[PDB]
Amino acid sequence: DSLVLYNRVAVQGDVVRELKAKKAPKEDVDAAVKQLLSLKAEYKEKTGQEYKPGNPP
């Protein structure tokens, strides 16, 4: 199901935004953003769809 992969990248995406809102150090934002990037890369493998905006349906 493509929806399952949708939730995985969406879950990290939000964690990065939350930490930055918490004024956390660059280490928390950089590491967390790197995590979401790995999820986005897998989505790209199918047809370059990457993290679609508007969160999961």
Residue position matching structure tokens 């990065």? 16
Structure tokens of 34?
Answer: 């790197």
CB 43 within 8 A of CB 9: yes
Its domain, for residue 34, covers: 1-57
Hey, is 7 helix, strand or coil? Answer: helix
Rounded Cα distance between 8 and 20, Å, is 20
Q: Where are the beta strands (DSSP E) in the chain?
A: none
What gap in Å lies between CA 31 and CA 52, rounded to an integer? 21
| Nearest alpha-carbon partner for 44 in 1, 7, 4, 9 | 9
Q: Quickly tell me which residue has 């929806």 as its tokens.
A: 3
- Which approach determined this entry? NMR
The count of domains in the chain is 1
Asked if 6 and 52 count as a contact pair (C-beta separation under 8 A), the reply is yes
The domain that holds 48 is classified in CATH as 1.10.287.10
What is the token pair recorded at 52?
Answer: 């679609």
